[PDB]
Nucleic acid binder design. Structure first.
Ligand SMILES: [Mn+2]
Ligand SMILES: [Mn+2]
Lengths: 612, 161
RNA sequence: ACUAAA
């Protein structure tokens, strides 16, 4: 009779990967209960004794928080009662997979448990959830002996996994408490508000009988960004301005467009004076000549924010569609995990191998083959926030195989990987300064020397320009014509989906996976409508809500509130505060907000009445 | 007697109107020019001062202005930036000074970068001009070589928020 | 029906 050790992973693909590693190619695979999960069995050594290893996976959160009993039927509970009186419980997630039963039957005879879950807050929460599931069935073990384990990993290479098995740690309770508090707050504050608003506005205005008005600490600020942009667009008064341009002819039909050093002057009389003090002269002198070699930096590693931002700007894709296509590519086995914050390649990575698989594609065969002969350049050091390695290809594909919208995403990802292991562009900058009367003019121009990573990413190419003539100080060039140009300051445009993602990440609103969902939710509720080249336009209903929130209480729509509450919840994670004191205090400050909202709800009625 | 005071003010470039300012400060042993400029510096040049600038600076007829003269600033505007955002790094700074002698208004333009004058200068300070200065299209052309700020406050508030 | 996050 040999002892057994049970391991849990966060997703079956990672389970299979860590099973293939660390077992030297020996596995016994079974599918038990649910069809998604699997059990991998093998033998080995642990704590100095022979042991059998059973390792399986749990698909995401086992359980989720929801209200208990009657306090979920909308017509029989007061919304204001949701803050403190309504109890909560962690019921289940995706009930069709009996995850609790599967874990119980799997850990029937296990003596140790090692958690291979992700190194993040949600990973810790799922760790404690599975742990609570499994302890009631485990063996009683012994006295002063340590049984629960946790492993820390960020890459799926052989050496890293073996090291992570060599050194083991312990979980922490404070992070799990922090995420539990976060879940409870986001449930109550937002369920109460949505229930009140939907019950109120449906019964007073008829055009929104079947619609749903929703509030939350993640989508309301997202709507607020677009409403602020619309306010700036509609509150803009254009100005008129004058720019003075000179054309200089050097040799025969060679004409150079000079640029004014003072780029713009906003006064008619001033522009007229400068024109009158320049137009008469027919001669020019050169003052300064410059020739400086500069470089264009290669792109960093690819994370999900960058992938969505480029897919929504160049590929004409939505965020949710892009992530669904990425997930399909990942589950087929062509892209490594498509939800990461990490932009730094692990030190022990097979960079050479992954670049070799692309050597037989006609699109970039020449560049890849050359790059392996002269050596690979080191990738740029970025941010390594644990989690999973950056998005990189794993297998060779041809357009006939993937086809359609799936192929366009594959090309950009695999062009990013080749670019990040290539050389920087080296372009020469030339400037010549002129003097036509008591004014200073300048001309620019760029010529490329080594294209570098421009070859695999054509759209980031230095534009082709002629070659500023080689002229030294004291050379004389006749002037052809000088004249003004009446220009007007253009007004900005509506926010693009690419720009919004930057604003979400800058203010800490949403995670790597909730960003696509929040953008889609505000589209489904008819708050915003997508139009033209992926531009978000506030709908008449959306404008009233955000404008109404400013009059009532601004810090329900202000972006900075989300970062503030996260800071307080982080204090629990460090252990320097208490779970109930922080949760209770934050509930109290928001509870009085609902009362001030309900008794002063007439503020939005004035704005809604005109627009319905 | 104030003949010496009149000669001193004429030489220095201050052009006070009459003996009203003389009678304003009639303290004993207080007939000194070097500290009679002190009170006039804060005193409103709109209220006090004579008319010796030409009649048609803005007409464009005149070309060059001679002699050192003290004048008062009224409004400051950055003509290289839009009104919505006064500050802007997209264009080099360029100021359109509005200047006065007490009765006649004039407009001056900054060419070269000046460290003494900025947007935050008090709306009532005094600047002294030395040497020959150029007038183009009725506008003064001020450079770093012919400007001397003298400070002073004329109890004009900010009137902005 | 809701909020959020794997
Ligand atoms: Mn995860
Ligand atoms: Mn994440």
């Amino acid at each position: 009779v040999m002892k057994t050790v049970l391991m849990v992973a966060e997703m079956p693909s990672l389970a299979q990967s860590i099973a293939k590693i660390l077992s030297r190619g020996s596995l016994s695979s079974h599918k038990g209960l649910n069809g998604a999960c699997s059990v991998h069995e093998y033998t080995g050594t642990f704590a100095g004794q022979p042991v059998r290893f059973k390792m399986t996976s749990v698909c995401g959160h086992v359980m989720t928080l929801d209200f208990l009993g009657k306090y979920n039927k909308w017509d029989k509970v007061d919304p204001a009662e949701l803050f403190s009186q309504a109890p909560t419980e962690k019921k289940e997630a995706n009930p069709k997979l009996n995850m609790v039963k599967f874990l119980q039957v799997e850990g029937r005879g296990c003596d140790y448990i090692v958690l291979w879950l992700d190194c993040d807050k949600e990973g810790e929460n799922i760790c404690f959830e599975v742990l609570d599931a499994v302890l009631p069935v485990m063996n009683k073990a012994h006295g002063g002996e340590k049984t629960v384990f946790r492993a820390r990993f960020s890459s799926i290479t052989d050496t890293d996994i073996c090291n992570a098995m060599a050194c083991l740690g312990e979980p922490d309770h404070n992070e799990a408490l922090s995420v539990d508090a976060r879940q409870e707050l986001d449930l109550r504050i937002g369920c109460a508000f949505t229930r009140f608003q939907t019950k109120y506005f449906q019964g007073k205005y008829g055009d929104l009988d079947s619609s749903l008005i929703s509030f939350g600490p993640c989508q309301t600020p997202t709507l607020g960004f677009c409403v602020e942009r619309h306010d700036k667009i509609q509150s803009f008064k254009p100005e008129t301005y004058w720019v003075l341009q000179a054309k200089v002819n050097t040799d025969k039909d060679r004409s150079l467009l000079l640029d004014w050093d003072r780029v713009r002057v906003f006064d008619r009389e001033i522009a007229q004076m400068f024109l009158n003090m320049t137009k008469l002269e027919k001669e020019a002198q050169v003052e300064a000549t410059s020739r400086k070699e500069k470089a264009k930096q290669r792109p960093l590693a690819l994370n999900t924010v960058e992938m969505l931002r480029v897919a929504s700007s160049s590929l004409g894709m939505g965020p949710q569609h892009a992530m669904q296509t990425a997930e399909r590519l990942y589950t087929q086995g062509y892209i490594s995990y498509p939800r990461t914050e990490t932009t730094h390649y692990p030190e022990n990575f097979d960079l050479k191998g992954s670049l070799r698989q692309q050597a037989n594609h006609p699109y970039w065969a020449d560049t890849v083959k050359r790059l392996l002969a002269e050596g690979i350049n080191r990738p740029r050091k970025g941010h390594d926030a644990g989690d999973h390695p950056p998005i990189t290809p794993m297998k060779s594909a041809t357009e006939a195989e993937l086809g359609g919208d799936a192929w366009r995403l594959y090309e950009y990802i695999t062009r990013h990987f080749i670019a990040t292991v290539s050389h920087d562009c080296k372009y020469l900058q030339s400037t010549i300064s002129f003097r036509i009367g008591p004014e200073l003019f300048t001309c620019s121009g760029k010529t490329v020397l080594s294209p570098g990573f421009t070859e695999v990413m054509p759209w980031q190419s230095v534009p082709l320009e002629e070659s500023l003539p080689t002229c030294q100080r004291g050379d004389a060039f006749p002037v052809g014509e000088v004249k003004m140009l009446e220009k007007q300051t253009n007004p900005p445009d509506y926010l693009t989906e690419a720009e919004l993602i930057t604003l979400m990440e800058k203010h800490g609103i949403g995670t790597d996976a909730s960003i696509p969902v929040h953008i889609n939710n505000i589209c489904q509720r008819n708050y915003v409508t997508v139009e033209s080249g992926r531009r978000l336009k506030p709908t008449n209903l959306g404008i009233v809500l955000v404008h109404g929130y400013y009059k009532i209480d601004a810090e329900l729509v202000l972006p900075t509130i989300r970062s503030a509450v996260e800071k307080q919840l982080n204090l629990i994670a460090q252990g320097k505060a208490d779970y109930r004191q922080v949760l209770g205090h934050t509930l109290d400050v928001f509870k009085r907000k609902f009362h001030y909202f309900v008794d002063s709800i007439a503020g939005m009625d004035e704005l809604m009445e005109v627009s319905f | 007697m104030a003949q010496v005071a009149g000669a001193a003010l004429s030489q220095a470039g201050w052009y006070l109107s009459d003996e009203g300012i003389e009678a304003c400060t009639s303290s004993p042993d207080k007939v000194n020019v070097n500290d009679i400029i002190l009170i006039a510096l804060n005193t409103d040049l709109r209220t006090i001062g004579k008319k010796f600038l030409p009649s048609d600076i803005n007409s464009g007829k005149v070309e060059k202005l001679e002699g050192p003269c003290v004048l008062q600033i009224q409004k400051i505007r950055n003509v290289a930036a839009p009104k919505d955002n006064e500050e802007s790094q997209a264009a080099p700074r360029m100021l359109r000074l509005q200047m006065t002698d007490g009765h006649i208004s004039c407009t001056a333009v900054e060419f070269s970068y000046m460290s003494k004058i900025s947007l935050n200068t008090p709306p009532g300070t005094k600047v002294k001009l030395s040497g020959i200065v150029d007038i183009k299209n009725g506008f003064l052309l001020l450079n770093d070589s012919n400007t001397t700020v003298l400070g002073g406050e004329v109890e004009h508030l900010i009137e902005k928020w």
